[PDB]
């Protein structure tokens, strides 16, 4: 169960990684921007779950998600967006692009655990 977590906020990366860890998910690769996230996906196609923010330089997560969905080896990859984009327009925009679960920032560590548990259960 190989996860890639993409967020330009290093403390958010920390929280998601620790929370994944507490749910029994240890094989987490990180990225800061959509470009590095795409290169990582592209070079490590055995990745199982993409977790991405939206707002970031060097390609936003929306364009990251569309680029992932268009790729022939990532059509069924589960995509979780974790974003401050709480507006429904953005939720709609993102499900349209291929986002499968949407978690809205901000959250307590314990709220993130409950919410990731809903999507991923434990491993
Ligand atoms: Mg936040």
CATH assignment at residue 34: 3.40.50.2300
Sign, CA torsion 109/114/120/123: positive
Domain count, the chain: 1
8 Å CB contact between 61 and 103: no
Of 43, 51, 67, 65, whose CA–CA distance to 9 is shortest?
51
Residue in this structure with the two tokens 């069924």, named with its chain if needed: 76
Alpha-helix residue ranges (DSSP H) falling in the chain? 10-22, 34-43, 61-70, 88-97, 109-120
CA 101 to chain CA centroid, Å, is: 9
Which residue range(s) make up the domain with 91?
A: 1-123
Would you say 41 and 4 are in contact if contact means Cβ atoms under 8 Å apart?
Answer: yes
Specify whether the CB–CB gap between 40 and 47 falls below 8 A.
yes
Residue 73 C-alpha to ligand 1 middle, in angstroms?
31
Dihedral pair phi/psi, residue 111, rounded to 5°: -70, -40
Q: How far is the CA of 50 from the centre of ligand 1 (A)?
A: 18
Give, in order, the Cα–Cα distances in Å from 112 to each of 48, 71, 72, 93: 20, 29, 31, 22
Measured in Å, residue 56 CA sits from the centre of ligand 1 at 13
Distance between alpha carbon 17 and the CA centroid of its chain, in Å? 11
Tell me the structure's resolution in angstroms, rounded to a single decimal. 2.2
């Amino acid at each position: 169960m190989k996860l890639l977590v993409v967020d330009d906020s290093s403390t958010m990366r920390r929280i998601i990684k620790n929370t994944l860890s507490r749910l029994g998910y240890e094989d987490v690769l990180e990225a800061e921007h959509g470009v590095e996230a795409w290169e990582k996906l592209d070079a490590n196609a055995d990745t199982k779950v993409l977790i991405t923010a939206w707002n970031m330089p060097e390609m936003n997560g929306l364009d990251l998600v569309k680029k992932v969905r268009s790729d022939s080896r990532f059509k069924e990859i589960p995509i979780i967006m974790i974003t401050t984009e709480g507006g429904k327009a953005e939720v709609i925009t993102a499900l349209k692009a291929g986002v499968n679960n949407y978690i809205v920032k901000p959250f307590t560590p314990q709220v993130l655990k409950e919410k990731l548990e809903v999507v991923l259960g434990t491993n």
